[PDB]
Protein backbone atom coordinates (compact mmCIF):
# COMPACT_ATOMS: atom_id res chain seq x y z
CA UNK A 1 0.00 0.00 0.00
CA UNK A 2 1.19 3.44 -0.94
CA UNK A 3 1.90 5.86 1.73
CA UNK A 4 1.35 9.35 1.02
CA UNK A 5 0.57 12.07 3.87
CA UNK A 6 2.58 10.12 6.48
CA UNK A 7 6.43 9.50 3.97
CA UNK A 8 8.69 7.19 4.02
CA UNK A 9 9.82 8.10 7.71
CA UNK A 10 8.78 6.17 10.88
CA UNK A 11 10.66 7.22 14.00
CA UNK A 12 10.54 4.18 15.99
CA UNK A 13 12.41 5.81 19.25
CA UNK A 14 14.90 8.56 20.34
CA UNK A 15 17.49 6.95 18.17
CA UNK A 16 15.77 4.18 15.82
CA UNK A 17 13.66 4.82 12.57
CA UNK A 18 11.83 2.94 9.48
CA UNK A 19 12.53 3.70 6.14
CA UNK A 20 9.88 2.72 3.74
CA UNK A 21 11.91 2.16 0.42
CA UNK A 22 8.59 1.93 -2.42
CA UNK A 23 8.02 1.94 -6.03
CA UNK A 24 6.35 5.44 -6.94
CA UNK A 25 3.16 3.36 -7.96
CA UNK A 26 4.40 1.69 -11.24
CA UNK A 27 2.61 0.13 -14.01
CA UNK A 28 5.07 -1.99 -16.43
CA UNK A 29 4.23 -2.70 -19.97
CA UNK A 30 6.32 -5.88 -20.50
CA UNK A 31 7.02 -9.14 -18.94
CA UNK A 32 10.34 -9.10 -17.04
CA UNK A 33 10.45 -5.89 -16.42
CA UNK A 34 13.26 -4.23 -14.23
CA UNK A 35 12.07 -0.97 -12.17
CA UNK A 36 14.96 0.89 -10.01
CA UNK A 37 14.53 4.14 -7.85
CA UNK A 38 16.93 5.49 -5.34
CA UNK A 39 16.73 7.57 -2.14
CA UNK A 40 19.36 9.42 0.14
CA UNK A 41 19.43 8.78 3.23
CA UNK A 42 17.58 11.74 5.41
CA UNK A 43 20.56 11.34 8.06
CA UNK A 44 24.07 12.71 6.92
CA UNK A 45 25.78 11.14 10.16
CA UNK A 46 26.83 7.35 10.32
CA UNK A 47 24.06 5.22 10.77
CA UNK A 48 23.32 1.06 10.92
CA UNK A 49 20.85 -0.76 8.87
CA UNK A 50 19.80 -3.92 11.40
CA UNK A 51 16.40 -5.02 10.01
CA UNK A 52 14.65 -5.46 6.61
CA UNK A 53 10.85 -6.12 6.30
CA UNK A 54 9.72 -6.97 2.35
CA UNK A 55 6.28 -5.22 1.52
CA UNK A 56 5.86 -7.04 -2.26
CA UNK A 57 2.82 -8.11 -3.83
CA UNK A 58 2.63 -11.81 -3.87
CA UNK A 59 1.35 -12.06 -7.26
CA UNK A 60 3.25 -9.28 -8.92
CA UNK A 61 7.19 -9.19 -7.79
CA UNK A 62 9.62 -12.14 -8.67
CA UNK A 63 12.31 -11.01 -6.49
CA UNK A 64 13.83 -7.39 -5.00
CA UNK A 65 17.41 -6.40 -4.66
CA UNK A 66 18.47 -3.27 -2.36
CA UNK A 67 22.04 -1.58 -2.71
CA UNK A 68 24.13 0.69 -1.07
CA UNK A 69 25.92 3.25 -3.11
CA UNK A 70 26.92 6.81 -3.98
CA UNK A 71 26.18 7.62 -7.30
CA UNK A 72 22.87 6.47 -8.46
CA UNK A 73 22.45 5.55 -12.11
CA UNK A 74 19.93 7.98 -12.63
CA UNK A 75 17.95 10.94 -11.40
CA UNK A 76 14.25 10.38 -11.61
CA UNK A 77 11.33 9.15 -9.93
CA UNK A 78 12.26 5.83 -10.99
CA UNK A 79 14.11 3.77 -14.18
CA UNK A 80 14.95 0.77 -16.37
CA UNK A 81 17.49 -1.08 -14.73
CA UNK A 82 19.41 -1.70 -18.17
CA UNK A 83 20.31 1.34 -17.60
CA UNK A 84 22.12 0.66 -14.26
CA UNK A 85 22.12 0.14 -10.83
CA UNK A 86 25.22 2.78 -9.75
CA UNK A 87 27.39 4.07 -11.59
CA UNK A 88 30.08 3.61 -8.75
CA UNK A 89 29.89 0.29 -6.71
CA UNK A 90 26.95 -1.55 -5.68
CA UNK A 91 26.77 -3.30 -2.57
CA UNK A 92 23.69 -5.26 -1.77
CA UNK A 93 22.18 -5.59 1.37
CA UNK A 94 19.46 -7.76 0.81
CA UNK A 95 17.83 -10.04 -1.81
CA UNK A 96 14.06 -11.05 -1.33
CA UNK A 97 12.98 -13.77 -3.27
CA UNK A 98 9.81 -15.26 -3.98
CA UNK A 99 9.52 -19.35 -3.00
CA UNK A 100 12.95 -18.47 -0.56
CA UNK A 101 12.87 -17.77 3.03
CA UNK A 102 14.86 -14.73 3.88
CA UNK A 103 17.02 -14.82 6.83
CA UNK A 104 17.23 -12.52 9.26
CA UNK A 105 20.60 -10.37 10.29
CA UNK A 106 21.69 -11.80 13.69
CA UNK A 107 21.12 -9.54 16.47
CA UNK A 108 24.08 -7.05 16.97
CA UNK A 109 24.70 -7.40 13.29
CA UNK A 110 24.08 -4.22 10.93
CA UNK A 111 25.73 -2.72 7.91
CA UNK A 112 27.79 0.60 8.08
CA UNK A 113 25.54 3.22 6.45
CA UNK A 114 25.89 7.35 5.83
CA UNK A 115 28.88 8.85 7.08
CA UNK A 116 32.25 9.91 5.74
CA UNK A 117 32.49 7.12 3.83
CA UNK A 118 29.33 4.92 4.24
CA UNK A 119 26.53 4.91 1.36
CA UNK A 120 24.43 7.59 0.97
CA UNK A 121 21.43 5.60 -1.17
CA UNK A 122 19.57 3.04 -1.20
CA UNK A 123 18.62 1.76 -4.25
CA UNK A 124 15.97 -0.61 -4.71
CA UNK A 125 15.19 -2.98 -7.30
CA UNK A 126 12.01 -4.74 -8.14
CA UNK A 127 11.97 -7.46 -10.71
CA UNK A 128 7.75 -8.26 -12.05
CA UNK A 129 7.06 -11.24 -13.27
CA UNK A 130 3.39 -11.19 -15.30
CA UNK A 131 1.54 -8.45 -16.06
CA UNK A 132 -1.85 -10.73 -15.92
CA UNK A 133 -1.72 -9.27 -12.26
CA UNK A 134 -2.19 -5.76 -13.26
CA UNK A 135 -4.45 -6.27 -15.82
CA UNK A 136 -6.64 -3.32 -14.37
CA UNK A 137 -4.07 -0.68 -14.70
CA UNK A 138 -2.82 -0.66 -10.99
CA UNK A 139 -0.39 1.91 -9.75
CA UNK A 140 2.41 -0.58 -7.67
CA UNK A 141 4.08 0.56 -4.36
CA UNK A 142 6.43 -2.40 -3.74
CA UNK A 143 9.58 -2.23 -1.80
CA UNK A 144 11.56 -2.83 1.31
CA UNK A 145 11.04 -1.12 4.77
CA UNK A 146 14.61 -0.62 6.21
CA UNK A 147 15.56 -0.63 10.34
CA UNK A 148 17.95 2.22 10.68
CA UNK A 149 19.43 2.85 13.98
CA UNK A 150 22.44 5.51 15.55
CA UNK A 151 23.41 3.10 17.59
CA UNK A 152 26.83 1.56 16.78
CA UNK A 153 26.21 -2.17 16.83
CA UNK A 154 29.18 -4.41 18.73
CA UNK A 155 29.38 -6.85 15.25
CA UNK A 156 29.20 -4.80 10.99
CA UNK A 157 27.88 -6.91 8.08
CA UNK A 158 29.72 -6.78 4.97
CA UNK A 159 29.87 -8.45 1.46
CA UNK A 160 32.39 -10.52 -0.18
CA UNK A 161 32.33 -11.06 -3.69
CA UNK A 162 33.62 -12.86 -6.17
CA UNK A 163 32.98 -12.39 -9.54
CA UNK A 164 34.95 -13.10 -13.02
CA UNK A 165 35.96 -10.78 -15.44
CA UNK A 166 37.47 -13.25 -18.06
CA UNK A 167 35.49 -15.79 -18.56
CA UNK A 168 34.56 -16.94 -22.13
CA UNK A 169 32.37 -19.78 -23.19
CA UNK A 170 32.25 -20.99 -26.59
CA UNK A 171 29.50 -22.08 -28.34
CA UNK A 172 28.14 -25.37 -28.31
CA UNK A 173 31.02 -26.40 -25.32
CA UNK A 174 30.05 -28.62 -23.14
CA UNK A 175 31.48 -27.48 -19.82
CA UNK A 176 33.83 -24.23 -19.03
CA UNK A 177 34.36 -23.40 -15.16
CA UNK A 178 34.75 -20.09 -14.09
CA UNK A 179 37.18 -20.39 -11.17
CA UNK A 180 37.59 -17.20 -9.08
CA UNK A 181 40.80 -17.63 -6.13
CA UNK A 182 42.44 -14.24 -4.05
CA UNK A 183 44.04 -15.02 -0.41
CA UNK A 184 42.29 -13.56 2.39
CA UNK A 185 44.58 -10.84 3.87
CA UNK A 186 41.99 -8.89 6.27
CA UNK A 187 41.09 -9.54 10.16
CA UNK A 188 38.66 -12.32 10.41
CA UNK A 189 35.23 -12.58 8.75
CA UNK A 190 32.30 -14.84 9.77
CA UNK A 191 30.20 -15.91 6.58
CA UNK A 192 26.55 -16.58 7.43
CA UNK A 193 24.90 -16.42 4.13
CA UNK A 194 25.81 -16.31 0.47
CA UNK A 195 23.88 -15.53 -2.67
CA UNK A 196 24.80 -16.63 -6.01
CA UNK A 197 24.32 -15.03 -9.36
CA UNK A 198 24.19 -15.87 -13.30
CA UNK A 199 22.10 -15.69 -16.11
CA UNK A 200 21.04 -18.93 -18.02
CA UNK A 201 23.88 -20.83 -18.90
CA UNK A 202 25.00 -21.48 -15.43
CA UNK A 203 24.52 -24.72 -14.25
CA UNK A 204 26.50 -24.63 -10.58
CA UNK A 205 27.99 -22.29 -8.17
CA UNK A 206 30.44 -23.05 -5.52
CA UNK A 207 32.54 -21.22 -2.86
CA UNK A 208 34.52 -22.50 -0.06
CA UNK A 209 37.50 -21.63 2.18
CA UNK A 210 41.05 -22.89 1.74
CA UNK A 211 42.80 -23.61 4.48
CA UNK A 212 45.96 -25.77 4.71
CA UNK A 213 44.58 -26.90 1.60
CA UNK A 214 41.28 -28.09 3.67
CA UNK A 215 38.18 -27.28 0.95
CA UNK A 216 35.73 -26.07 3.92
CA UNK A 217 32.05 -25.09 1.98
CA UNK A 218 30.50 -22.14 2.21
CA UNK A 219 27.71 -22.23 -0.34
CA UNK A 220 26.52 -24.58 -3.00
CA UNK A 221 23.67 -23.81 -5.37
CA UNK A 222 21.70 -24.00 -8.39
CA UNK A 223 22.13 -20.31 -10.19
CA UNK A 224 18.53 -21.09 -12.03
CA UNK A 225 16.66 -21.66 -8.62
CA UNK A 226 15.69 -18.06 -6.54
CA UNK A 227 18.64 -16.38 -6.28
CA UNK A 228 17.99 -15.44 -2.72
CA UNK A 229 20.81 -14.90 0.23
CA UNK A 230 20.58 -18.81 1.73
CA UNK A 231 22.30 -19.16 4.99
CA UNK A 232 25.56 -21.14 5.14
CA UNK A 233 24.52 -24.42 7.48
CA UNK A 234 27.76 -23.57 9.77
CA UNK A 235 28.88 -20.26 10.28
CA UNK A 236 32.31 -20.04 8.63
CA UNK A 237 35.48 -18.32 10.12
CA UNK A 238 37.80 -16.67 6.99
CA UNK A 239 41.02 -15.57 8.89
CA UNK A 240 43.91 -13.83 7.78
CA UNK A 241 45.93 -16.46 5.03
CA UNK A 242 43.02 -18.34 4.06
CA UNK A 243 42.46 -19.05 0.30
CA UNK A 244 38.91 -17.86 -0.56
CA UNK A 245 37.98 -20.18 -3.97
CA UNK A 246 34.96 -20.01 -6.36
CA UNK A 247 33.86 -21.98 -9.41
CA UNK A 248 31.16 -21.32 -11.52
CA UNK A 249 30.03 -24.72 -14.21
CA UNK A 250 28.50 -22.77 -17.31
CA UNK A 251 27.85 -24.70 -20.32
CA UNK A 252 27.64 -22.98 -24.52
CA UNK A 253 24.60 -25.28 -25.70
CA UNK A 254 21.72 -23.51 -27.25
CA UNK A 255 24.54 -20.79 -28.42
CA UNK A 256 24.96 -19.42 -31.94
CA UNK A 257 27.99 -17.26 -30.64
CA UNK A 258 29.96 -17.32 -27.94
CA UNK A 259 29.70 -15.37 -24.41
CA UNK A 260 31.41 -13.58 -22.16
CA UNK A 261 30.91 -11.63 -18.88
CA UNK A 262 28.91 -8.49 -19.09
CA UNK A 263 25.65 -6.77 -18.41
CA UNK A 264 22.86 -7.78 -20.71
CA UNK A 265 21.11 -10.61 -20.65
CA UNK A 266 22.81 -12.33 -23.69
CA UNK A 267 25.52 -12.09 -21.65
CA UNK A 268 27.07 -13.92 -18.42
CA UNK A 269 27.92 -13.20 -14.76
CA UNK A 270 29.92 -15.07 -12.06
CA UNK A 271 29.01 -13.95 -8.79
CA UNK A 272 29.19 -15.23 -5.40
CA UNK A 273 28.05 -12.98 -2.93
CA UNK A 274 29.35 -13.99 0.36
CA UNK A 275 27.70 -11.96 3.08
CA UNK A 276 29.68 -11.98 6.15
CA UNK A 277 30.04 -10.51 9.84
CA UNK A 278 32.86 -8.64 11.97
CA UNK A 279 33.77 -7.41 15.19
CA UNK A 280 33.03 -3.43 14.66
CA UNK A 281 36.85 -1.99 15.19
CA UNK A 282 38.28 -5.13 12.86
CA UNK A 283 35.12 -4.35 10.22
CA UNK A 284 35.26 -3.41 6.74
CA UNK A 285 31.96 -3.46 4.65
CA UNK A 286 33.31 -4.73 1.35
CA UNK A 287 36.04 -6.67 -0.14
CA UNK A 288 36.09 -7.95 -3.67
CA UNK A 289 37.83 -10.92 -5.39
CA UNK A 290 38.42 -10.18 -9.69
CA UNK A 291 41.52 -12.73 -9.92
CA UNK A 292 42.88 -16.21 -10.22
CA UNK A 293 45.64 -16.36 -7.79
CA UNK A 294 45.81 -19.74 -7.55
CA UNK A 295 44.83 -21.55 -10.57
CA UNK A 296 46.54 -25.05 -10.06
CA UNK A 297 44.87 -25.03 -6.79
CA UNK A 298 41.71 -26.19 -8.48
CA UNK A 299 42.77 -29.52 -8.94
CA UNK A 300 41.74 -30.40 -5.49
CA UNK A 301 38.52 -29.40 -5.57
CA UNK A 302 35.16 -31.46 -4.51
CA UNK A 303 33.58 -33.03 -6.93
CA UNK A 304 30.11 -31.69 -6.08
CA UNK A 305 31.59 -28.96 -7.82
CA UNK A 306 31.28 -30.37 -10.74
CA UNK A 307 27.48 -32.09 -10.18
CA UNK A 308 24.40 -30.12 -10.46
CA UNK A 309 21.35 -30.75 -7.94
O1 LIG B 1 36.51 -17.91 14.14
N1 LIG B 1 36.66 -19.33 14.44
O2 LIG B 1 35.60 -19.82 15.32
O1 LIG C 1 21.69 -9.78 -14.46
N1 LIG C 1 22.17 -8.83 -15.45
O2 LIG C 1 23.56 -8.49 -15.19
CU1 LIG D 1 13.45 -12.32 -10.05
CU1 LIG E 1 23.82 -10.48 -13.92
NI1 LIG F 1 34.34 -18.41 14.75
Redesign the pocket.
Known amino acids: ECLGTIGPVTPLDASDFALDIRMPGVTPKESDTYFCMSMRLPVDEEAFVIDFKPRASMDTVHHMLLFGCNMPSSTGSYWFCDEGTCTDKANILYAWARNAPPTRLPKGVGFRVGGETGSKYFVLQVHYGDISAFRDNHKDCSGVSVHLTRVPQPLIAGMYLMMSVDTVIPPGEKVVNADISCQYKMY?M?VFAYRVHTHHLGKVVSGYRVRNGQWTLIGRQNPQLPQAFYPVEH?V?V?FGDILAARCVFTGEGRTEATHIGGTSSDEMCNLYIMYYMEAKYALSFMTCTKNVAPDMFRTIPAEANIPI
Do not use: G, I, K
Open positions: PHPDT
